[PDB]
Amino acid sequence: NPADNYHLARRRTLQVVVSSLLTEAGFESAEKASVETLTEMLQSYISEIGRSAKSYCEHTARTQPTLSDIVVTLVEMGFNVDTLPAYAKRSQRMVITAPPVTNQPVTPKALTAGQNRPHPPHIPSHFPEFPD
Amino acid sequence: KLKLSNTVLPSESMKVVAESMGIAQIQEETCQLLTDEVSYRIKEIAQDALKFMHMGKRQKLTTSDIDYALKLKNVEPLYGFHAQEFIPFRFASGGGRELYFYEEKEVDLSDIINTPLPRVPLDVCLKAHWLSIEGCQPAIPENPPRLKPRSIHELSVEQQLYYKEITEACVGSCEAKRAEALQSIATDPGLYQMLPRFSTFISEGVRVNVVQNNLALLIYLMRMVKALMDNPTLYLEKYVHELIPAVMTCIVSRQLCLRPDVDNHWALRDFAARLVAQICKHFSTTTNNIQSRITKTFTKSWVDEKTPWTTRYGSIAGLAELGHDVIKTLILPRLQQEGERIRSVLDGPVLSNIDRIGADHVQSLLLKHCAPVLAKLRPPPDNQDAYRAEFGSLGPLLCSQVVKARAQAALQ
Amino acid sequence: PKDAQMMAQILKDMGITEYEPRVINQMLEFAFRYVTTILDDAKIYSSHAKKATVDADDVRLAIQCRADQSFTSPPPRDFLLDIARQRNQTPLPLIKPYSGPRLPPDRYCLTAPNYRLKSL
Amino acid sequence: VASMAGVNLSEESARILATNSETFLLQAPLQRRILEIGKKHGITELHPDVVSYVSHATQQRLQNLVEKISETAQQKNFSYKDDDRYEQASDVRAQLKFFEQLDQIEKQRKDEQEREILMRAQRITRVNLRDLIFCLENERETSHSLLLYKAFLK
Amino acid sequence: TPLVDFLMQLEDYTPTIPDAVTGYYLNRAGFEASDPRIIRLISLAAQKFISDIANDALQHCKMKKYTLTMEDLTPALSEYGINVKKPHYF
Amino acid sequence: HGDQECYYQDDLRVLSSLTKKEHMKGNETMLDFRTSKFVLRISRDSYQLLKRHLQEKQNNQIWNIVQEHLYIDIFDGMPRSKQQIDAMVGSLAGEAKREANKSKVFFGLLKQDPNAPPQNRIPLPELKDSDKLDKIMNMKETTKRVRLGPDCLPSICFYTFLNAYQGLTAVDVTDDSSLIAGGFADSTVRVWSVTPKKLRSVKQASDLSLIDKESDDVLERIMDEKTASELKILYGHSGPVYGASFSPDRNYLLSSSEDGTVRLWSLQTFTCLVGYKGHNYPVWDTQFSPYGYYFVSGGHDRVARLWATDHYQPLRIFAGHLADVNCTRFHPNSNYVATGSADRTVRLWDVLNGNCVRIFTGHKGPIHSLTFSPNGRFLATGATDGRVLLWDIGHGLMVGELKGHTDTVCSLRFSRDGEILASGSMDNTVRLWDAIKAFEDLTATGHINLPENSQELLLGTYMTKSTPVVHLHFTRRNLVLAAGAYSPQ
């Protein structure tokens, strides 16, 4: 369940993003194989600006990418970057809230115990205590 | 002995693909030529995806192993589409396509939006424990599992001291001590081979603890029983013949201490006892021994004339918590008797006895059970005065309880 | 299914006992992608030779012209042993005693001032 | 050209404006070159419009690669520190220089110890091989090839 | 600097894809979240790609609106040079 | 195919797939098997019966295949038993010649030892005053070091990764048990401090310019307290990190991954410094030298490269394996590199001249773990057959076989004294072997009669809760550390 969820939370958000862009277009009720196709092209697109803008900045001896490394990355994917300020200011756009995180409930209960036998001198104090 | 073969994909699947593309009239030698080439590439990749399984230290080939095995053979990991130019996605895995054989092949586009997203699991943390203490593996939860000679007890003195501390903590002088001792009972792996002495301490305790009706002593022992049951390591159905008559006694017995006031707890003593009773009939089940035996004792407790009303209330609760069908088949032909008992308590002036309190509790519990028993097997039509055909006990208030249940179902 | 039960026998003949259920579904998706790019190129080669029937030499051509580009391999042993002996002949350089953090030249490292935009 | 909205059409049209914002092979030795490889297949003579078609095909192969390495050889000639729309975030080189100065102080202490022991006794763009290697592992051809693998050692 | 101005405006802008999900697939490829606005521009670029494919597919559906079928994605991605594949094996 | 020995099933399955010529023309492992010669060590008492059945014209065709494709290396001695031949075969182009295992190997430790190399043989780096300060507190740990033996069995402290839903693929611990690195499948390296001392980065260059050097505190002055965590995540690999290696001065983490790069992460700035791009293919392992300047990385391209953290290009290419170089381990004197591989051979490589000086064959699966004895005399290797084979290095002879484990043995380490070899595998067990009784005896037949003594050399087996033992480490006070992601499976 949790290992599936690690991958699935981030894929299901991608699928909801795809469904929302399809609705904005005009499509209501799409084919099932056409949604897992388009959300596979969406994950492969975020993973390709991840690998290529990291490659363009590290070619210039840097470690984190600036704006000038992505506007050359998107050019090498054929994007026509200038049309993006008009796309961001739509009136039809939605906002998909991010997948819920189990980290907020990170720790239910933490406690200590006594009567554990002492550490021998080949075990330092920072190792866990000997049990009951 | 090794009868290893060479299995290829069927050729009658390759002609279906060819004629659904525009390439008709293909020969069999042309079609067999396709299915040994592609069956080699599947065998070449699955042998190459097994390298990433071993390197990642897993025994299960995940879906991402084929994405790296394809990228290793200079083929794009993309499965759904193929980009001739290759510039929009260059050897970038899109994680495959979540498709099934038994799928619907058409969904509504607002069904995918309105479903709740799955919970992102916890991040990776580093906890340390002990596999071995100077050669011996500890039993912590991070680990898997002519004169005759003077004999020794089968418990150690650490184990006997542990038993004494756990039993003196489980009699509830301090609440934090109880709660740890209850969790210690609930998850000690080595609590077998001490379990006869725990079962005997429980059984013997309730029987000399109902001589004077000491409610805490009993509420603590029932919590000890509940903590004994949910422990997964120990084998309990050798000891359930002592456990079950102890809980029946908590539910079907009279209270020697003050009748009112703690009757609220007494209902919970009968609530905790009926919970553990139906949990014991859920487990340990063989043919016609345990569940039917306690069902028969509960029914002859019910049909017995002129009962103690404490015993009556406890047995009513016990028969009530037995599940879906049990109240569907048993509480049905008895509403008139319940109503007559309520009417007798009402008429007789006697108020200083416990009969009136017992009657009110029994009627409330029976009315709640009857409400869903009704919500479950009929529509909610005519909820005003049709229940007057069932002596008019809960009537419109029963209908309101059914409506609240329907609202909870709508929320679900 | 028909073609999905043969895929569980290709894995079991390779000794793969444990696998995810999505493993069969995407090896079939690759096998379908591979045969609809051999046969797509086979009728391109048939129209080049001007024959109305795509026969077995067209699929023999489309396999070996797709395997010449798609499925590559590591470099061969006579190529690896030639670049080894060309590299292993050069003697090891001496080390300067207090040069500092030993790194390549700065155009080969990832240590630059690493700028970012001003928030305004 | 077969695709009207093709994605490599928008690449090399926006790449040229990024470089604006900062072969013709010899016909006589090529015609002998095609014919010798033709002996291994039985292609004994060649059409007279082919040796100039391969020369036009070799030009558009290298011009697609000269333009590709020019837009990454000008990627390194963008100085951020002249602009003041950008802010510095992490300079590891300067921290390394301070560490080197501390190492030199340690070396000076060692030298003092040795002395005590003695007493007791118009921007121009140059394309490197990195810019060519960077434009080889990205394209699908020459990504797993013996010409890029050997280029890692040149 | 039109795009530098846009990225500077991208603070206070929430994109359709969350930054916990766009940043997850960027961390998977080595891209680390130094600046939120850069993650948001990458998210908007991916959104524009999917949206443009979807709008072309809708023009094809209107020509042959409503349901999106694989036979609408097939000519829509064909001008992009992308040959989409039917499942055909389930 | 069915009369072939059971240990050869994997190769037999790859061959059953190979039916065409062009299928084999791009395999590059059977392409190198067809051009090489099988070595086939046989005795002279059995070779006389073989050559009296092949020199006759009745079988001049199978004799023609033998003298074309097979070497035959003849030793004068007893014919080996079947359970001794089973112990030393299993590789492709396997059971190599004794003329390869007769070169002089300097298997001794540096500082007299006649087996020790000179200090100026390999140009090793200087020992700084901060590195000399490390060995002062290292011998304070050696004071509390217990003698383990077969009686005082060590305590094992398992450092399990609890959630780990990104798959953990690489662990390393520093030489003093202070840091634990984790290479994960989500392309991250994560450093954990295990001592009660948080991971701090050094201050920025503006903060270092205002402070002065020459101060006694200096390092303490430089630490930034604004950045202080029990966990630092390192981003920059575009693929699952498969190798992880600390430097002995506790800076300079190394990591290799599927994307074909080896990365040098600083542990003072906690950024990436260099990306070493020599492989185009998944680098399966990397390790720093025990003196900390050179490092070796083995990848899918069937070589192992020797780097120096100063050049963008390698110095030595170890290019004799026929399959993937799975493991790469340095000798304790760092003049020799052992590279286990997927063609079931372990090979020692001299850092001078790049020559293979030893070839160790006898594993039935790909080798997934190597370790050296602290003497430098011995080498323990583990593979997917669950066998731990103990090799001599001076004699080039296997000296023992430990066959207790069931699944792939993925981690080996000897004790700090050398008293116990610890083995961790995918059967979720940490087995301890007596590494003194296994080396009690120290040829021209090129083999020794192995004892079948595994039962007497097992001091104990400890089972993990559903947790494959990815790493094994020995504290300098002889305490076993082990790290593995808990996988419920």
XYZ file of N, CA and C in Angstrom, chain A residues 13-121:
327
model
N -2.084 12.826 -8.892
C -2.173 14.288 -9.062
C -1.926 14.569 -10.544
N -0.976 13.888 -11.180
C -0.746 14.214 -12.608
C -1.998 13.909 -13.425
N -2.697 12.818 -13.129
C -3.944 12.454 -13.845
C -5.034 13.484 -13.625
N -5.195 13.994 -12.418
C -6.219 15.029 -12.137
C -5.854 16.290 -12.897
N -4.572 16.625 -12.970
C -4.140 17.808 -13.749
C -4.547 17.572 -15.204
N -4.310 16.377 -15.714
C -4.665 16.104 -17.123
C -6.166 16.231 -17.296
N -6.956 15.673 -16.394
C -8.425 15.691 -16.532
C -8.884 17.135 -16.528
N -8.327 17.971 -15.662
C -8.687 19.404 -15.581
C -8.331 20.163 -16.859
N -7.150 19.949 -17.412
C -6.826 20.606 -18.706
C -7.757 20.126 -19.822
N -8.117 18.837 -19.821
C -9.071 18.311 -20.827
C -10.428 18.992 -20.662
N -10.892 19.168 -19.430
C -12.185 19.835 -19.196
C -12.100 21.274 -19.690
N -10.979 21.945 -19.451
C -10.848 23.361 -19.852
C -10.946 23.410 -21.369
N -10.336 22.449 -22.048
C -10.436 22.384 -23.525
C -11.891 22.302 -23.979
N -12.712 21.440 -23.386
C -14.098 21.211 -23.823
C -14.496 19.767 -23.713
N -13.562 18.906 -23.368
C -13.864 17.465 -23.317
C -14.544 17.127 -21.997
N -15.668 16.429 -22.027
C -16.319 15.940 -20.794
C -16.397 14.452 -21.034
N -15.910 13.616 -20.129
C -15.869 12.157 -20.369
C -14.918 11.797 -21.490
N -13.698 11.422 -21.168
C -12.696 10.949 -22.108
C -12.523 9.437 -22.008
N -11.909 8.867 -23.043
C -11.543 7.456 -23.030
C -10.459 7.210 -21.985
N -10.455 6.003 -21.419
C -9.556 5.718 -20.307
C -8.107 5.621 -20.768
N -7.862 4.953 -21.898
C -6.501 4.824 -22.406
C -5.941 6.148 -22.911
N -6.806 7.107 -23.240
C -6.367 8.425 -23.677
C -5.966 9.325 -22.520
N -6.383 9.004 -21.297
C -5.968 9.770 -20.130
C -4.634 9.267 -19.592
N -4.455 7.947 -19.476
C -3.149 7.411 -19.104
C -2.096 7.592 -20.189
N -2.492 7.854 -21.432
C -1.514 8.264 -22.431
C -1.026 9.679 -22.154
N -1.958 10.614 -21.945
C -1.595 12.022 -21.834
C -0.907 12.338 -20.510
N -1.225 11.613 -19.440
C -0.513 11.818 -18.187
C 0.827 11.102 -18.160
N 1.088 10.229 -19.130
C 2.417 9.662 -19.305
C 3.304 10.601 -20.110
N 2.718 11.345 -21.047
C 3.449 12.398 -21.732
C 3.677 13.607 -20.837
N 2.872 13.770 -19.788
C 3.068 14.878 -18.864
C 4.191 14.585 -17.878
N 4.247 13.352 -17.365
C 5.333 12.967 -16.469
C 6.664 12.914 -17.209
N 6.654 12.431 -18.452
C 7.862 12.411 -19.267
C 8.301 13.801 -19.699
N 7.419 14.794 -19.636
C 7.794 16.157 -19.982
C 8.411 16.897 -18.806
N 7.899 16.683 -17.592
C 8.517 17.284 -16.412
C 9.871 16.639 -16.142
N 9.981 15.334 -16.382
C 11.244 14.629 -16.201
C 12.270 14.960 -17.276
N 11.867 15.590 -18.376
C 12.809 15.947 -19.426
C 13.342 17.363 -19.275
N 12.553 18.286 -18.718
C 13.115 19.570 -18.303
C 13.909 19.415 -17.011
N 13.678 18.341 -16.259
C 14.517 18.075 -15.106
C 15.914 17.635 -15.501
N 16.005 16.739 -16.481
C 17.300 16.196 -16.866
C 18.071 17.136 -17.784
N 17.379 17.964 -18.562
C 18.074 18.783 -19.550
C 18.452 20.160 -19.023
N 17.655 20.744 -18.128
C 18.056 22.019 -17.547
C 19.107 21.828 -16.466
N 19.146 20.648 -15.846
C 20.270 20.303 -14.989
C 21.532 20.086 -15.814
N 21.386 19.537 -17.018
C 22.544 19.318 -17.877
C 23.075 20.621 -18.452
N 22.195 21.584 -18.727
C 22.647 22.850 -19.289
C 23.317 23.730 -18.244
N 22.890 23.644 -16.986
C 23.539 24.438 -15.952
C 24.861 23.817 -15.524
N 24.903 22.486 -15.387
C 26.135 21.803 -15.007
C 27.177 21.824 -16.112
N 26.766 22.026 -17.364
C 27.729 22.295 -18.422
C 28.410 23.637 -18.217
N 27.703 24.597 -17.621
C 28.252 25.900 -17.272
C 28.758 25.950 -15.838
N 29.157 24.799 -15.290
C 29.832 24.631 -14.000
C 28.977 25.033 -12.805
N 27.658 25.111 -12.955
C 26.771 25.471 -11.856
C 26.016 24.242 -11.367
N 25.318 24.402 -10.241
C 24.564 23.305 -9.644
C 23.063 23.530 -9.593
N 22.596 24.774 -9.504
C 21.158 24.959 -9.569
C 20.795 25.854 -10.749
N 19.731 25.518 -11.481
C 19.459 26.199 -12.751
C 18.698 27.502 -12.594
N 19.111 28.484 -13.386
C 18.496 29.799 -13.407
C 17.390 29.833 -14.456
N 16.914 31.037 -14.781
C 15.927 31.182 -15.840
C 16.555 30.995 -17.215
N 17.815 31.400 -17.384
C 18.476 31.310 -18.678
C 18.818 29.877 -19.067
N 18.747 28.934 -18.131
C 18.980 27.529 -18.424
C 17.714 26.794 -18.831
N 16.539 27.355 -18.557
C 15.276 26.709 -18.880
C 14.751 27.272 -20.190
N 14.992 28.565 -20.435
C 14.615 29.153 -21.720
C 15.532 28.720 -22.849
N 16.651 28.064 -22.547
C 17.398 27.333 -23.560
C 17.000 25.858 -23.578
N 16.531 25.312 -22.453
C 16.013 23.951 -22.406
C 14.697 23.825 -23.159
N 13.813 24.809 -23.002
C 12.523 24.758 -23.677
C 12.661 25.066 -25.162
N 13.672 25.851 -25.540
C 13.974 26.066 -26.955
C 14.424 24.767 -27.609
N 15.251 23.984 -26.911
C 15.707 22.709 -27.459
C 14.634 21.627 -27.438
N 13.462 21.898 -26.874
C 12.302 21.031 -27.021
C 11.247 21.618 -27.936
N 11.490 22.797 -28.512
C 10.548 23.411 -29.424
C 9.279 23.879 -28.750
N 9.375 24.895 -27.892
C 8.240 25.301 -27.077
C 7.632 26.641 -27.451
N 8.425 27.574 -27.997
C 8.027 28.967 -28.270
C 7.553 29.648 -26.981
N 8.542 29.871 -26.109
C 8.390 30.312 -24.721
C 7.569 31.598 -24.571
N 7.564 32.471 -25.587
C 6.878 33.761 -25.512
C 5.360 33.632 -25.366
N 4.773 32.508 -25.777
C 3.335 32.315 -25.628
C 2.913 31.935 -24.213
N 3.861 31.705 -23.308
C 3.574 31.295 -21.930
C 3.039 32.391 -20.998
N 3.434 33.679 -21.096
C 2.718 34.693 -20.296
C 1.246 34.852 -20.631
N 0.829 34.537 -21.859
C -0.591 34.603 -22.185
C -1.345 33.381 -21.685
N -0.678 32.227 -21.602
C -1.335 31.020 -21.114
C -1.536 31.062 -19.606
N -0.645 31.737 -18.879
C -0.733 31.749 -17.425
C -1.876 32.611 -16.914
N -2.340 33.568 -17.709
C -3.367 34.520 -17.292
C -4.731 34.165 -17.868
N -5.045 32.874 -17.939
C -6.359 32.440 -18.368
C -7.410 32.778 -17.316
N -8.668 32.799 -17.757
C -9.802 32.895 -16.855
C -10.467 31.550 -16.613
N -10.075 30.520 -17.357
C -10.692 29.204 -17.287
C -9.914 28.229 -16.412
N -8.793 28.640 -15.864
C -7.850 27.727 -15.238
C -8.341 27.244 -13.879
N -7.925 26.032 -13.526
C -8.213 25.408 -12.244
C -6.931 25.305 -11.429
N -7.074 24.859 -10.182
C -5.945 24.628 -9.284
C -6.197 23.315 -8.552
N -5.323 22.343 -8.812
C -5.419 21.014 -8.168
C -4.514 21.083 -6.951
N -5.091 20.923 -5.768
C -4.344 20.927 -4.497
C -3.505 19.661 -4.404
N -2.325 19.785 -3.805
C -1.247 18.779 -3.855
C -1.649 17.546 -3.062
N -1.057 16.364 -3.318
C -1.498 15.153 -2.646
C -1.353 15.215 -1.122
N -2.305 14.681 -0.335
C -2.188 14.829 1.108
C -0.932 14.119 1.635
N -0.231 14.686 2.624
C 1.063 14.123 3.119
C 0.886 13.445 4.482
N 1.453 12.244 4.656
C 1.383 11.486 5.929
C 2.496 11.972 6.828
N 3.390 12.779 6.289
C 4.461 13.374 7.124
C 3.850 14.288 8.193
N 2.756 14.991 7.899
C 2.233 15.898 8.950
C 1.987 15.008 10.167
N 1.342 13.820 10.053
C 1.316 12.871 11.162
C 2.617 12.044 11.111
N 3.781 12.693 11.261
C 5.104 11.997 11.250
C 5.305 11.095 12.475
N 4.999 11.581 13.673
C 5.355 10.766 14.863
C 4.212 10.667 15.871
N 3.562 9.491 16.032
C 2.538 9.317 17.064
C 3.037 9.277 18.522
N 4.101 8.518 18.824
C 4.547 8.391 20.243
C 6.044 8.059 20.372
N 6.779 8.813 21.200
C 8.219 8.550 21.439
C 8.504 8.531 22.948
N 9.197 7.497 23.455
C 9.426 7.347 24.927
C 10.742 6.618 25.227
N 11.161 6.607 26.497
C 12.442 5.965 26.908
C 12.178 4.937 28.025
N 13.168 4.091 28.350
C 13.004 3.041 29.386
C 14.226 2.955 30.308
N 14.071 2.343 31.494
C 15.182 2.161 32.457
C 15.353 0.696 32.845
N 16.470 0.311 33.490
C 16.798 -1.105 33.878
C 17.606 -1.806 32.780
N 17.840 -1.135 31.653
C 18.690 -1.703 30.581
C 20.094 -1.877 31.153
N 20.753 -2.997 30.851
C 22.107 -3.266 31.386
C 23.078 -2.253 30.783
N 24.178 -1.889 31.474
C 25.086 -0.858 30.991
C 25.797 -1.174 29.672
N 26.346 -0.158 28.993
C 27.123 -0.442 27.797
C 28.527 -0.911 28.168
N 29.024 -1.958 27.526
C 30.445 -2.294 27.629
C 31.289 -1.238 26.937
N 32.576 -1.101 27.297
C 33.363 0.048 26.804
C 33.681 0.030 25.316
